[PDB]
């Protein structure tokens, strides 16, 4: 099912902002695991792909595919969107952007 729960969406978005990229295998029957700092949270792979499709169609991320694996990277528009969606403090950066 592609009915993504809101808490699952926020956890994926929070992981996406912290580490600027998300890598997920292309399999409908699968699970994606993200560290999100402390603890570990798992989201179905089909639901992760559904969330990234919306961002891709909104020109908020860059998508790369190779060997059954997705590679999504937030661009400047996505980083600004992620900051506003999560209400992150201004001048908060992903680990890639961070010094």
């Amino acid at each position: 099912s592609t009915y993504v729960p809101k808490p699952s969406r926020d956890n994926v978005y929070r992981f996406f902002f912290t580490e600027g990229v998300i890598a997920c295998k292309k399999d409908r029957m699968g699970t994606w695991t993200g560290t999100l700092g402390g603890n570990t949270f798992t989201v179905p792979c089909i639901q992760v792909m559904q969330l990234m499709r919306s961002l891709k169609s909104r020109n908020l991320i860059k998508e790369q595919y190779a060997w059954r694996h997705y590679y999504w990277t937030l661009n400047d528009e996505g980083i600004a969107y992620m900051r506003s969606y999560l209400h992150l403090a201004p001048s908060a950066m992903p680990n890639t952007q961070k010094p």
């Binding site: 580490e19 600027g20 990229v21 998300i22 890598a23 790369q64 595919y65 190779a66 060997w67 694996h69 590679y71 990277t73 680990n95 890639t96 952007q97 010094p99």
Partner: protein, 212 residues
């Protein structure tokens, strides 16, 4: 428990093939020319060879850090166990990958096949290559597809020594009419150090030393 030697060697080779494909697609715009890695007990030290080094790095290494994150999550590398380096190609005219990518960009910018191909050949021979061959195929003129080949200099084709003296690369160009294939073959000169050449001379060349 521990993987056998045959399984470990296969696992390393499959990892390199996937890493090669990922970097080939991600750094197509830059002059990606190859990748090497050296796994130690502490880190992995992946090294990326490119001509347009500054763009693969990005602003304060933003793009290279994004590449590190992609490789880290894909292969489940722990924190601090993976490091990425980028080094410029010493001679970009002797790299078939750099030239076939340059040819691909020129063709995609609506440039004449004859002008684009001879530009690659002229540049490659100006870099010291003994020979260069460029092939372009597909629907160039109309509905019917032709293959055009432009060559200059030396080129060996048979035997196995041509796999160390000739650098070859092929790419797909997606134009409006369909797909176009471009190939670049470069005959490398013999560098004594063996850096950008196979060091040893041609297998069928005999040189008589001048008496002192």
């Amino acid at each position: 428990g521990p993987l056998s030697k045959k399984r470990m060697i296969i696992r390393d080779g499959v990892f390199y093939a996937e890493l090669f494909e990922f970097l080939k697609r991600e750094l197509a715009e830059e002059g990606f020319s190859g990748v090497s890695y050296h796994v130690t007990t502490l880190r992995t030290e992946i090294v990326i060879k490119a001509t347009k080094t500054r763009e693969v790095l990005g602003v304060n290494g933003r793009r290279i850090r994004e590449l590190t994150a992609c490789i880290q999550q894909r292969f489940n590398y722990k924190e601090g166990k993976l490091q990425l380096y980028v080094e410029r190609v010493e001679v970009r005219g002797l790299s078939a990958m750099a030239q076939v990518e340059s040819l691909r960009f020129k063709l995609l910018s609506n440039l004449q096949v004859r002008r684009a191909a001879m530009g690659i050949i002229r540049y490659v021979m100006e870099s010291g290559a003994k020979g260069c061959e460029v092939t372009v195929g597909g629907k160039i003129k109309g509905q019917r597809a032709k293959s055009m080949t432009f060559r200059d200099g030396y080129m060996i084709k048979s035997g196995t020594a041509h796999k160390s003296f000739v650098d070859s690369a092929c790419r797909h160009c997606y134009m409006r009419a369909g797909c176009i294939g471009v190939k670049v073959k470069i005959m490398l000169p013999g560098d004594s150090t063996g850096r950008n050449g196979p060091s040893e001379p041609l297998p069928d060349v005999i040189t008589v030393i001048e008496p002192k």
